[model samples]
Structures are given as structure tokens and as C-alpha cells.
Target chain A: MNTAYRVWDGEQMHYWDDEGLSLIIKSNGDWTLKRLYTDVLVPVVDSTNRNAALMWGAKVRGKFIYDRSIVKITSDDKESSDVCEVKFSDGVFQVDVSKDYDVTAVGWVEYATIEVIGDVYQNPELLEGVKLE
Target chain B: MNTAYRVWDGEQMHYWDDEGLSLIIKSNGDWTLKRLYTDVLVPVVDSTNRNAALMWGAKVRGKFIYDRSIVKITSDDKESSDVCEVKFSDGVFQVDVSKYDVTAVGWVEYATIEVIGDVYQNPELLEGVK
Candidate 1:
């Protein structure tokens, strides 16, 4: 699976194909190849993992999918929810409160909405309203 | 190329793959296959078109790549100036001054910074800035 990375260079955000491969930052005073050694980001999620990102993943697993603000909870290709919490267990993705956190079905990713809000490590505020089990 | 679209939808934005595909909005008052017909959005930019988005595509094109917002500016990628206007011409994005308006790359979608600003669109002044 291919990995992806992102870093905030103070004023703006930058997405990297991979980290610590070519863009290594070494700090020495009066250095020519300038790079900040501060605030290096950990790779949260591999872009290839469809299972981990069906609706949500965080804290333990290391990544998630789905749009942060708007995740469509659907039934029969109809939009049922625009906001909801997510969980994972066994081999299924369970949405919180909406479906009693039922870890049902594996192929839900093909039909249901997939989104990525944030990880517990980075943007914990996005994990609000999520009940822990 | 696959065309993409988004509608304000009177609430939040809805990103659509194609405008009049399977999810066609039909208004028949008491229709079973319910959908909103009014205020259907025109396709803005195709998701597959990278050339239209390279920080400067409003050069008399069908749709603009960048969303307009009055913002802070700096040449060194550091905040330096006040808010200003943005412009696009000759395959280049140019801000009004040195300049405040920010034309960002498509990657800005990764980490969106929220702020209580952009004075022109909103009537209320920011409490801190005031």
C-alpha cells in the first residue's frame, strides 16, 4: 500500500508523497539546505487502506476516511444522515447512535458513505460526540 | 474527464459527481422520488482537470479554480500585509497589491484553517480585530 504525508510549514499546509525519504530536515546553523526540524508529522493513514477508512478510525488504528465535516449516512442510496459518529470492530464498520453501533457487514464501504474527519492524535475536537467502547 | 460539482443546497455544500446524472432533481409537488429541483448547481470544475486548478485558471475560462476570499498576503509565504483583492490573467494568479488575497494550491483542502474574518462578505466585524 502506498503511503502519504502532510506537514504544516507555519503559514500553509503541504502534502508529501512520502516523509523522511528525500525531504529530510537537518538543522545546522548557517545551513544552505534550509528545512525546519520542528513539527514533523506522523503518517496517520495509508491512502490504500479502504477498510480502515470506510467511515472512521482513530486512537488505536492510526487513520480514517470520509470527509470531516459532511459524512453521508445512507439507506438504499438515499441520504439519511449528514452528521454521525463511527466505530470499527471485528471486521465491520459500525456507526454510532444511528445503528446502535452494529458492526455489521464488510462490503458497506461500496454502498455506504466513506469519510475522514480527523484522528484522535491530531484533531481530537473532531472526535466529539463519539462514544468510546 | 469526470466532471465534479457542488451545491450550497440552502444549508451546507454537497459535492456531486455529475449534475444531471442519476440524482436528477424533479419537482412534482407530491412526487415519491423526492428531490429538490430549484437552485440546481451548474458544474463548476471537473475533478479530473488539473490544468484548470494550477493556482491560475480564471483566465477567461468556463469556471474559476479558486474560491474568492479577501485575505492576508505575503511574498515569503509569511503573513505580512492586510486584506486585498485577487486576480487571474495570462496563466498567472495575481493579487491586487503585494498582496493580501491568497490564491492557494488545491492541497489547501488538507488542513483548512478557520478564522472569524473576511470582512467584505460578512457584515459583522470580528471582535478581536475590531
Candidate 2:
């Protein structure tokens, strides 16, 4: 799904595509996006690839971009004091400083629209080596 | 820990106890309380008990009690579009209509303080059932 979202970068607003960013929005409006990056793995005919990749969620800082205002979010896993200072890159939001508070939305909190990205295989699988369920 | 919180019940403000109510408040001000209702299980010497009971989290509703306001909460598990109509009763809040939204804080969002209650066992342990 696609959505029109206003992103805050601590000083400016960046109107971006929420769906293209890979996000999952909750009923109450909180959004979360988890992008699966499996480029290192080679896929077989019909199979899921597993690889080591670093990806994170996006945070919606401030009510608008440019305002640079910060939104405080907390969750059971981590907490974010300021949701503004973070940004999204290659489908992941930065979280070096957002692991303090509990029950947080991180720097990238999901919104009304959500986006899910698949995996990227690096090598070709041996077609005959694959099996069907 | 005790906190002075403003509960919105849709239109009014109600000042209440945030600590004594067995709530777990997040750094972001969201509160959650999970009261364990194991009153039906009996505890054995130095053992824990389990029971069948019903308890729920309390929603902050609006910013006050009488204000009758509401706070929309959502989690990976559930969501609440209008949270002001809910209330906390005897350690457990109500959530009969707030289970649709994913990634929700339920009706009762934990605050700064956290309160945890243990189990209530019945039929005392067999002691020495040998």
C-alpha cells in the first residue's frame, strides 16, 4: 500500500512515500516496517533465502517535517527519547540512541499505510536441488 | 511509585492513582498493567500456583476522568480507536471492544510506575501428599 506521509528531519519536512519505505501501520495509527534483506544467500528453485543483513524500522519525528520537533516513543523492547533525530536509509531507521526507554515506537513509527519488502538472493539455486511441499 | 495522571473519559478529567493501580508506565508515558489472576491454583511449599481468572488493563481514556476523553492505543496484538470509554476495576481494566487494532497499548497504557500482583491459589498445597 502507498501513503502520503510528512517526515521530520529535525529542521525540515520531507514528503515521502510511506508504502515505498516498507512500514506496517496499526489500527491506532502507529506504524512499523520490517524489510528482509537476504542478498548474501542464494535461492533454490522454490525456497526462501536466509542471510545476514542489518535493517531497522522508520520513526516519524515531530508532527511535520522541518518542525524538527521530537516525538517520544517507548515499547516493550526499546524506547526513543526523540523520534526526530533519526532517518530512514535503505529501508532501515537508525536506532543507536533509541534503545533506552521501554515500550517505544523507535525513530520510525509505522503509520496508516504499511510496506513489506521481500528478500534478494545473491546466487542462483540448483533447480534440481529444490523440492515441493 | 505513585504518579498524578490525567484520565480522559471522552469529555471530562479524572485524577487517580497511577501506582496503586498496578500499572507499568513506559518512558513515553504509556502505561500497562497485567494483573495475574491465578486464584484457582494452589501453591505447594515454595512453589507457584496457577488458576483461571479474568483481568484486563485500564485505559487512560482522555486526559482526565470526568472529562470523558479517550486515547487511541494500538499494538502488534490489538488497537483502540476510542479509549476514553474504558475503566480500571479491581486491578483489571476492561477490553471487550478494544481488540481490533494491531500494535496497540490496549485500553490501559502503563505509565511511569509499575505494579505486579502474584497468583491467588486455592485448595492449599497437598503439603506432604506422600
Candidate 3:
């Protein structure tokens, strides 16, 4: 999942993409990149593990496939949530990256990432490379 | 299309559902019923009248079906937003009504309804009739 953060950098909009990585944004306007992490988001009902992912391995983009063994819940359940799959289909980030492994992995990099994901309820403005229209 | 409003009534939670209707929550905390109005939402991309729902009649609950003529945009576009379809799946409002027709359509009743829809960001609690 490509999670992005965008902010007005005075001159131009600055974007940071933490795709396949975890980020921590401080109270002050500072971007810190954290290590990459992956967790198998399983629902309570799927206790049988018949369709659960290997519980390991992070597949590269366009390489992952849907396994039938995993039961799926399409709706956003206040009680049951599965994934934080926010795709960067829109060009909001000036810098974007898709890490192949966790941030702690040999090739992983760590830095200060953005803290705020922006107001989801209020009409959030886009500042990236793509046109909203 | 049942929209709802839930609030902390101080003692307990309160909820109101305006399914198939528009709502108005006043500045003061007061509850009043009002008339319902329906409007056909059409997409701009479909310049022709091929898939459009007659653009006339409003169907009753469970009566509406998808017409091939209407080209639908499933995703939310900040540019061309479509519907405010917020389903009240949870138990929120103490009162809920699925009006068959628009409030102005003869049997319509009007009253001042509640004013607040509650915050979506924070953890909101629910209260209403036990």
C-alpha cells in the first residue's frame, strides 16, 4: 500500500510516499520515515486459517495475487477492520517509494516521516503531480 | 437511503434516521420533522439518454433496480461527486423513518429536526430509546 503525505512547502507542494513502509509524524511539522512492517490482517471469523496468507513474506507490487482460502469482508465494519490499503493512484507525493521488504531489512532505510495523514472528513486538497479531475 | 443522527442526550444516546429524505438540524438542540425531496443524480459523462433512469419516478425501498442506461462512477471523485449515500447500518437514532414519498408529495409531514450529525473523526457514543 502506498501511503502518501503532502504539504505546502512554500515554494511548491512537497509529498512523501511511504509505500510498503511505516511512518511516524511528530506533533511539530516534521517527516520521519520508519521501518517497513507487514502484518497479516485476519478477521475474527477466519479462525480456521484455511485461507490465511503464509503469515509471512511481502510480495512486490503487481506480483501479489488473491488467494481463495482467505475470506473477504468488503464493507467497513466498525467492529472488524482488515487492511489499511490506501493506494497512491493519485499523485500526491513528490517522493514515492515501494520497499520490497520491511524497513529493518538489509536494504531498508529509515528517516523521519510525516505525522498527519490529513483531514479525511473535510474536503482535502490535493497538491501532488496528478490532476484531481 | 436511511440517513441517521446520533448524539449524547446527556443521560444516554439518541438517534434519528432520515431515510429517503433531507434533514435540517437547527442551531439550538431541538428535534422537528420536515418534508422530503428527491432529486435524480445524473452523471455528466453520459451526454446521451441511454442509461438514465427515466429521470422521473422515485422508487420505493427495495423497488429500485439498476438500469443499464446510467453510467455510474463507483469511486468518490473530489471533482464529480455523486451521492451522499450514508447508510445507517448501526443502531443510532431512536427515531427512524423511511418515507415512501417526498414530504411535499401530499402525505408529507414537516417539523424542525435535530441539528447535529456528530463528529466522524472522534469516538462518538450512541444514545436513544432503550
Candidate 4:
């Protein structure tokens, strides 16, 4: 639960906890963390609290993003062109990389790791020649 | 429950369901999927059924292996040096690969994919990644 849930706001990455910035999606589709400037009732003209609160749904650059969305990640060692998807599977997660057998060990892949490689929307080429249909 | 639990014997990869291939580790340390010859009680010499049942835990090539163990894998495409591991996390699993996102989509990585890249114990460099 201590995860840095974030989404790319077109130019940069925006997290659910951006300081005092809560989340809001106006009628025009502007989902992100922004502080209330005046007293506006979100899609109305009364209260402003409903317009600014904890959130994760975003419409950045005409795209949708939620907290439990999928993410791209690579090994901490940046060398392989192995593009892997990190997403929750029925509450658990899985990595999509491969290695040869050791003949000595039964399963030695679990004791491994990764780093934030690139954004799926921002870095498309990073997944070229690797993740094709 | 319906898992394809498998292990690699020295000669070839073995599985818990390899045509009724059970497992045994003698005092000399020989772990792998194997069937009884006929009258050997696995570390004993009276019974034969216990030696030819469903199981895992292999001691192939002077190494240790067991069920719920680790294994190496790669993406379906054999282009990148991307090596990954597919193992149960508490009860779930994880994939160690990166992907680009589509702006028109919301959380696209979830509906992604992968293929069995390689073995773990008998394979190493394939893990030049993951």
C-alpha cells in the first residue's frame, strides 16, 4: 500500500500524493492533482471540496490511467533489450523475462530484480523488436 | 492446483506429471523425476509404489531443486537479452519486463504477454537480465 501510484500527465509523471494537490476530472476531462484556487463545485457552482480530493483516474493527453494500471520495468542493470510488463495478476504480480537453466538449481529466477525502465505511453521505442504482437 | 510443476533431470527436464514420474533423493544426493526399477524402496529396498508416484525435488548435477522453486524465462520474441523469472509470490506471480504505453489506453500492461524463455538451474546467462 506504500506504493508511489502515479501517472504521466503528458509531459511528466503525476502521483496520487503530489503534496497538497488532490485529484479532479473536470467536464473537459482534466484528471490530475491540483489545488483548489477558488470555491468551485467541481462540475457545479456550489462547493469546491468534491472537486479536490484523493484520486488516481487521469485523462492526461486524452489517455486514461488508474492506480492498478500496468507498468513497464527493466532489470536494474540497463543492458538487455528485454521489455517486461509489471502488473497485478489476481492480486499477485509477474515478470516476463527469461534465462537459461543452471542444471544445478531448480528455480533461480525468483531471486532477481528490476528498475523503472520507461513509460508505456512516453517510451514506445523502448519496446521495439522486443514486444511485438 | 492445475500447475505445470516441473524440474530438470540431468539428461532432460522432468516434471511432476512426466508419465507418472515420481521423485527421490538418496543419501548420495540424487534428486530428480525418476521411476522405480521394480523392487527398490527409494532409500530402502522393499516397497516400489512410493518410488513411482507424483512428486518433485531434484538433485541434478550436484545441485538442489524442489517444487515451488525458481525458473528462468524470456519473452516470446528472441530479440532482446531480456531474461525474466516466473514464480509464485506468496500465491500470485510477477513478470520482469518493460513495455511502452499507449496514450489511447488505460493501464495497458495488464493485458500483455510472454513465453517460456529458458530454464534456470541448467541456464544462467539467459539471465543476463530480469
Number of the top candidate by DockQ?
Answer: 4
Candidate 2 vs candidate 3: which has greater lDDT?
Answer: 2
Measured on C-alpha atoms, candidate 2 has an lDDT of 0.26
| lDDT tens readout by residue for model 1, A5-44 | 2333333333333222212211110101113334543333
Please give, for residues A76-104, the per-residue lDDT of candidate 4 as tens digits: 43343344544322322334555242211
TM-score of each: 0.22, 0.17, 0.14, 0.28
Give per-residue CA lDDT, model 2, range B22-78, as digits (tens): 222221222332222363322111101122221222233322221122333333333
Q: Name model 2 segments beyond 4 Å from true.
A: A1-47, A52-59, A62-103, A108-133, B1-130
For candidate 1, write residues B3-106 as lDDT tens digits.
12223323233333223321111111110111234655333332233322211122112333322344443445544434333333211233334322232222
* CAPRI rating of model 1: incorrect
lDDT (C-alpha) at residue B21 in model 3:
23
Give the Cα-based TM-score of candidate 4 against the true structure: 0.28
- Ten consecutive residues with minimal summed lDDT in candidate 3 chain B? B85-94
Which candidate should be chosen as best, given lDDT against the real structure? Answer: 4
Q: Pick the candidate with the highest TM-score.
A: 4
> Each prediction's Cα lDDT score?
0.30, 0.26, 0.22, 0.33
Report the C-alpha displacement of residue B22, candidate 4, in angstroms: 54
Residue A100 lDDT, candidate 3, scale 0-100: 36
In the range B23-126, model 4's lDDT, one tens digit per residue, is 32221222323354565423221113333222222232233223222322224444333434443322223344343311111111333333333344435534
Q: C-alpha displacement of B121 in model 1, angstroms?
A: 66
Query: Candidate 3: what lDDT?
Result: 0.22
Real A-B contacts recovered, model 2? 0.00
lDDT measured at residue B114 in model 4 versus the true structure, 0 to 100? 32
User: iRMS for model 1?
Assistant: 24.5
